[PDB]
Amino acid sequence: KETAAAKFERQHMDSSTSAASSSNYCNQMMKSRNLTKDRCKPVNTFVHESLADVQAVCSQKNVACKNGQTNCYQSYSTMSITDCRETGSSKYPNCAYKTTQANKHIIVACEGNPYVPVHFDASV
């Protein structure tokens, strides 16, 4: 079964670009990472930094997770991210998203050895 670390990379890492270039990045990315498989995942964030830089967040600003656990961490730096949010009219299986590029701090839950992100909690 996919490791939570690998699932995080599939769902949230896109170290290719520095940003979202096109307005259907999300339509394309949400497909190619298997997030429009069975249903349209409504909301999802892609991080446009190195994996190393994202993993390093696990040694940055410790914060509570939304679920009240205390193994979350806020990136000290803003990061290039793309917020994908399904449109109001989107209907599976033709999943449609707005793409919003932004530079924000990320909050991730970290776990395991190596101690890496297993969950994307928020961006701030």
Contact 83, 48 (CB under 8 A): no
Annotated catalytic residue: which of 12, 13, 83, 110?
Answer: 12
d(CA 40, CA 38): 7
Domain housing 108: 2-124
Instruction: Name 105's Cβ contacts closer than 8 Å, sequence gap at least 6.
Output: 74, 75, 76, 77, 78, 79, 123, 124
Active site residue 119: yes
Task: Give the residue among 1, 118, 116 at the shortest CA–CA distance from 60.
Answer: 116
CATH code assigned at 87: 3.10.130.10
Domain count, the chain: 1
d(CA 106, CA 123): 4
d(CA 54, CA 17): 15
Resolution (A): 1.5
Contact 96, 31 (CB under 8 A): no
Active site residue 48: no
Binding residues for substrate: 7, 10, 41-45, 66, 85
